[PDB]
């Protein structure tokens, strides 16, 4: 049993079972993955990592579930349920890789387009690896938990299911599944909204303690849901204003997103040569460490500096891109487009995108002809739901003018909105 | 030109010459050195690094020197002066090593007791290395700086020295109290890290630095021009000293935080024969010798912690297992604290000898368990209105708590079983008596 002091939430009280889960290599790993990935290179206040965010989610999940239980004792929320919701909140982000959403949002689709990987699935596998490598099951049993049922409950809270599709808890407790990851209103967003604003200097006027006070479980369409009070909607709209401010000012920051693609580019040029030893001694690459949780345990933002400090000549190309970040010679912005309709470019097809741009035939024939390797195509998703930006690695005014020509034509070819 | 958004100071406008100093590998290296060292392992909000703090000192040094310049043209503060004071503020911490004060405060004294190293000497050497590796001298001249004098002025502002300085004459005495004031203890460096640390630690800081800068003036105090605060800022100054006191007592001197610093140092010492950092000309350096070559030093950051932790080399297993104790939270055990009240203080050159002294103390009641030097950690904790001069608004040209102990000594034990901890306490009590240090409290 411990208290951890956090600048966002103050004193965070942790049950002994939560402390045993936290003080493992699988959890402490999150200290080395920056929350905003490459955003730190734009926002110096944004040095925070997934670890303290995870503590905050575990704390918030516990407060909300405990407050529901005290106000409504008929829900039959047990102290076993509370701990399991806290574990899910603590562990929901175990699966993130180097630079957070850059890794599963961009790097893995570009290195292995045929593989389906999410950080959430990663959190389930890391959670299983954490449980199994630290003898956590006996400590769960020691504190009232029933491992087989509750471990499944925790995983379903993180990833969802595989008519009532959940096995960890029955349908009369369906509201427990809305706490950690939802409506789009869960305690995970509460923590990172507040924490990101604190680190970015952005005012945040959503008050989570007030939403907890007035949370109750009601029935809607013969289903139990967490609902807020009547006139408490204003606090709600303040949360959505903070969501949009954060998305507009930080998450979609043009230079932030460029730098992430540069880091990804360096990881790709390094993926053949970095070795990470996993289970039994087997060796893995950055792109295959997701296949072995012992190797994944050792895959963090440190990969950036392993490349940057390396001397192997084979890592020269990767190294040179990171060096371009330090000297601030970044890829150059070409323009932005959106797919019309409800069409979404799928992660599977990211790698094909630069080729399509280089295959466009700009009407006027430009002096400079560019190759698919000179183009970056950055697909920015939100949950306008998809934006597409193109950057060019060639800096000369000549290549940049040509790069815009390929980009403009490519949008027409796919009938995307025309660049402005 | 460029602008950087910072949560403490808001928009930080950066002159193009500062931008060119910042966008170098020597400066960006500060992104990989945590401000509080091992404190992050006790305070999850304290993920911040020396990079963002150095931007803030650069910013604050500029605001103060510009404010004095605009309100007191008689001081002849040039736009060249402002830039030099900004550069010094930006570059004053370039010399920190992995985990900041742990590195020069503890690791180098224990690894090379014969060397005299400070991060401030490091900052000068790294600043020089930054200048010459990135062609900064021409960019200086392009903006009106005279490199030979101005580089000297910048270095003296960082490291220190009748008038002993050569970068500026004595009539600009006051420029040397902006970035680093050892005499007074009130500089813009502390203003940033007070505000920044409180922000990441959730400690309220009532010191309002902008208001203090607004009312700062240069006045002659005993034949020297010195920066002075308006007399009505005494309440704001109280708030600064209360913040200083809170930070030292709750954070800088935290018991678990300091134990973790010694564990990391212990791991570096166990790894030091086996890590190699490639310096200039391809020559190989170690964690402890990377200070002798700024090319190797550029690549020595907190990364070394994970290099050790993720290693598979059987030669790094001992170092690696210490770092794993941190992750499992099986830390060294606190034994007690003492102070050398009324005695000569312990010096860096003697840190290495302390564990053998403790283990050699002869507790008069013989005990079962015998402990050796290697089971003991001896952690020496140094802390450093005395000379703060005021002025009144009517005569604007004529000048007008609970002191923390100078040196604290804590002892930790690596044996965790409880008979050994009892024995460690007996050795420690006897050692304090042997050295006429204060008797430890229960
Ligand atoms: Zn999260
Ligand atoms: Zn500093």
Author numbering:
A (entry chain D): 115 to 276, 284 to 303, 306 to 506, 546 to 582
B (entry chain A): 115 to 275, 284 to 506, 515 to 530, 542 to 583
Tell me what the authors wrote about this structure, in their words.
Identification of SAMHD1 as the factor that impedes infection of myeloid cells by HIV and SIV brought to light an intrinsic cellular antiviral immunity mechanism that relies on controlled reduction of deoxynucleotide triphosphate (dNTP) availability. To counter this infectivity block, HIV-2 and SIV viruses encode an auxiliary protein Vpx, which targets SAMHD1 for proteasomal degradation and facilitates infection of noncycling immune cells by these viruses. Collectively, our results shed new light onto the intricate allosteric regulation of SAMHD1 activity and raise questions about the role of nucleic acid phosphorothioation in dNTP metabolism and antiviral immunity in bacteria and in humans.
DNA phosphorothioation replaces one nonbridging oxygen with sulfur and creates a chiral center at phosphorous. Conventional solid-phase synthesis of phosphorothioated oligonucleotides is not stereoselective and the two stereoisomers, Rp and Sp, can occur with roughly equal probability at each phosphorothioate linkage. To further explore this, we used NMR to investigate the interaction of SAMHD1 with the d(TG*TTCA) oligonucleotide containing a single phosphorothioate bond after the sole G nucleotide. This oligonucleotide was used because it could be readily separated into pure Rp and Sp diastereomers by reverse-phase chromatography. When SAMHD1 was titrated into the NMR sample of crude d(TG*TTCA), we observed that 1H NMR signals corresponding to the Rp diastereomer of the oligo gradually disappeared, whereas the signals of the Sp diastereomer were affected to a much lesser degree. In the anomalous electron-density map, location of the sulfur atoms in the SAMHD1/ d(TG*TTCA) complex corresponded to the Rp stereoisomer. Furthermore, when the oligonucleotide was modeled without the phosphorothioate modification (e.g., oxygen modeled in place of sulfur), a significant positive difference map peak appeared at the Rp position to indicate the presence of the larger sulfur scatterer. In summary, the recognition of the GpsN modification by SAMHD1 is stereospecific for the Rp conformation of the phosphorothioate linkage.
